[PDB]
Amino acid sequence: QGVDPPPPPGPPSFTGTKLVNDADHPWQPLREGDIRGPCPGLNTLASHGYLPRDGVATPAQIITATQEGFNFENNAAIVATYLGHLLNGNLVTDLLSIGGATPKTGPPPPPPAHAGGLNVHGTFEGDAGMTRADEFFGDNHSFNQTLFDKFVDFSNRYGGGFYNLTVAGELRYSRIQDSIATNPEFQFKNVRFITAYGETVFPINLFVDGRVTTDRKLSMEDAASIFRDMRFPDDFHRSAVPASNEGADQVLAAHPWVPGGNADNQVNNYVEDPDSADFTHLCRLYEFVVGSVQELYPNPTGILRRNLIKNLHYWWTGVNVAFGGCDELFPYGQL
Numbered sequence: 001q002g003v004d005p006p007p008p009p010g011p012p013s014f015t016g017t018k019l020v021n022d023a024d025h026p027w028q029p030l031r032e033g034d035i036r037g038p039c040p041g042l043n044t045l046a047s048h049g050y051l052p053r054d055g056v057a058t059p060a061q062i063i064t065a066t067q068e069g070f071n072f073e074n075n076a077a078i079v080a081t082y083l084g085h086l087l088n089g090n091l092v093t094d095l096l097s098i099g100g101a102t103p104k105t106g107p108p109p110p111p112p113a114h115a116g117g118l119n120v121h122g123t124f125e126g127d128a129g130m131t132r133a134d135e136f137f138g139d140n141h142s143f144n145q146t147l148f149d150k151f152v153d154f155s156n157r158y159g160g161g162f163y164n165l166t167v168a169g170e171l172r173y174s175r176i177q178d179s180i181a182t183n184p185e186f187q188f189k190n191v192r193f194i195t196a197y198g199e200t201v202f203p204i205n206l207f208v209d210g211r212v213t214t215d216r217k218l219s220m221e222d223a224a225s226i227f228r229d230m231r232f233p234d235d236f237h238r239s240a241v242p243a244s245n246e247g248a249d250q251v252l253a254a255h256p257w258v259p260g261g262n263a264d265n266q267v268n269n270y271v272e273d274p275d276s277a278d279f280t281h282l283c284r285l286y287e288f289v290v291g292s293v294q295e296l297y298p299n300p301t302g303i304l305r306r307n308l309i310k311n312l313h314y315w316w317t318g319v320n321v322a323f324g325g326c327d328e329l330f331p332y333g334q335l
């Protein structure tokens with residue numbers, strides 16, 4: 001049993017704006033067994049049928065869906081998708097849950113690997129999210145109205161009632177402070193440190209209608225529609241160019257910050273980690289993740305070994321471009 005995993009799709013042929021909330025991709029409510037998780041992007045694509053509506057998909061489906069639905073840039077899609085798949089997907093069946101555990105991903109892999117989906121805390125998903133609560137408080141996937149209220153507040157205080165790059169700079173810092181003060185297990189290093197800055201500009205670059213060319217800013221009605229209800233705005237047109245994390249540099253600049261966490265199970269006790277990846281040391285992220293994959297798969301032998309080798313190579317093709325050159329690692333050798 002098992003699947004032979006194809007290489008990732010390339011960029012879409014057509015890269016302009018278009019109506020994505022169309023007749024063939026209607027919003028529909030969740031059925032029994034349907035899965036949703038911490039990503040509002042993937043959630044919206046599933047609830048409109050760009051992904052399978054049950055929220056379980058192949059890497060290739062996820063990549064084509066983020067491109068068709070949102071014009072997410074090809075390399076960015078590769079980096080995110082195979083990261084999620086290596087850590088949280090089933091490499092043998094080639095299926096990833098965008099939320100929690102489900103029989104739909106197929107017969108479970110050998111522990112410590114889990115294939116328990118994007119909900120799994122610790123190596124990918126982490127703390128100081130915009131509309132999701134830290135895992136320490138008991139739920140890392142659900143929309144949180146109190147946190148959305150803070151999104152609205154900061155938009156009112158810094159963005160004239162809209163979400164824009166200024167708001168993102170301020171909100172990111174403030175959420176870090178919230179977690180320092182209230183979460184003794186707060187971690188903000190490695191994958192999370194990098195992903196946390198990119199996530200704060202995705203709403204600007206990808207959730208703002210593509211026909212808006214100037215003074216791009218997101219309304220709270222549209223924010224609520226996507227973040228809470230998993231629904232495209234009416235007549236939503238995607239970005240007119242492939243995009244991802246443009247502006248993330250500026251968000252960090254507004255309140256410079258260093259990877260680390262609360263030490264010794266205590267609040268207000270943030271200690272820097274000088275070994276973590278950061279924005280001038282991106283290849284460390286690659287090495288760390290390959291490390292984590294070795295911990296999940298200490299001695300694979302069969303179809304599982306084959307599919308690990310392929311998925312690792314696929315990921316590297318994206319990482320190499322995105323991080324400006326990394327030496328490929330071969331922890332399971334060549335095919």
Ligand SMILES: *[C@@H]1O[C@H](CO)[C@@H](O[C@@H]2O[C@H](CO)[C@@H](O[C@@H]3O[C@H](CO[C@H]4O[C@H](CO[C@H]5O[C@H](CO)[C@@H](O)[C@H](O)[C@@H]5O)[C@@H](O)[C@H](O[C@H]5O[C@H](CO)[C@@H](O)[C@H](O)[C@@H]5O)[C@@H]4O)[C@@H](O)[C@H](O[C@H]4O[C@H](CO)[C@@H](O)[C@H](O)[C@@H]4O)[C@@H]3O)[C@H](O)[C@H]2NC(C)=O)[C@H](O)[C@H]1NC(C)=O
Pocket residue numbers: 158159160164165166167215
């Ligand atoms: C996200 O969204 C938010 C919200 O919309 C958005 O915020 C806007 O940000 C821009 C900046 O990018 C703001 O525009 C700038 O505002 C600067 C501050 O203006 C104040 O001070 C001015 C300077 O006063 C001089 O003169 C007085 C004498 O009167 C003197 O005492 C002072 O010492 C000083 O020397 C002042 O003119 C201005 O007041 C005018 O405007 C207000 C309306 O806002 C009006 O009520 C007043 O009566 C008066 O007409 C104000 O109090 C300002 O310095 C800056 O100007 C520079 O650029 C212009 C060119 O655009 C040049 O002409 C000039 O030489 C300056 O170099 C500019 O106007 C804007 O106001 C924000 N809007 C809000 C609501 O906050 C973010 O940008 C968004 N983020 C992203 C990434 O898009």
Ligand SMILES: *[C@@H]1O[C@H](CO)[C@@H](O[C@@H]2O[C@H](CO)[C@@H](O[C@@H]3O[C@H](CO[C@H]4O[C@H](CO)[C@@H](O)[C@H](O)[C@@H]4O)[C@@H](O)[C@H](O[C@H]4O[C@H](CO)[C@@H](O)[C@H](O)[C@@H]4O)[C@@H]3O)[C@H](O)[C@H]2NC(C)=O)[C@H](O)[C@H]1NC(C)=O
Pocket residue numbers: 133134137139144145146147178181182183184265266267
């Ligand atoms: C949606 O998301 C929000 C935000 O994450 C959740 O609300 C948080 O819930 C946690 C857990 O109950 C709260 O944590 C506690 O906060 C105390 C500080 O509170 C004051 O200061 C903050 C920050 O300025 C204010 O927002 C707040 O109103 C108070 O004025 C801490 O002192 C507590 O620490 C104690 O427990 C920890 C853990 O055991 C120990 O390590 C400490 O030493 C100490 O004994 C604690 O951390 C947090 O304040 C809440 N925030 C907000 C904004 O309400 C919601 O629960 C969530 N909703 C759902 C349904 O999930």
Ligand code: HEM
Pocket residue numbers: 038039040041042062066070072076077080081084118124125126127128129130131132192195199200202203206207
């Ligand atoms: C390409 C595959 C994708 C994967 C695997 C993925 C995965 C994730 C994960 C795991 C999180 C949670 C992060 C955390 O708490 O640390 C997340 C959050 C997020 N994703 Fe995605 N994502 C993908 C694509 C997209 C796309 C295309 C968009 C935008 C259109 C998007 C927008 C977001 C936003 C805004 C958040 C933050 C939600 C919040 O903090 O409240 N993602 N994603």
Ligand SMILES: CCCCCCCCCCCCCC
Pocket residue numbers: 039079080194195198199245322323
């Ligand atoms: C947050 C939703 C998508 C996940 C982002 C994962 C990307 C990891 C690194 C991105 C590259 C940053 C510098 C080019």
Ligand SMILES: [Mg+2]
Pocket residue numbers: 038125126127128129132133134135140
């Ligand atoms: Mg989170």
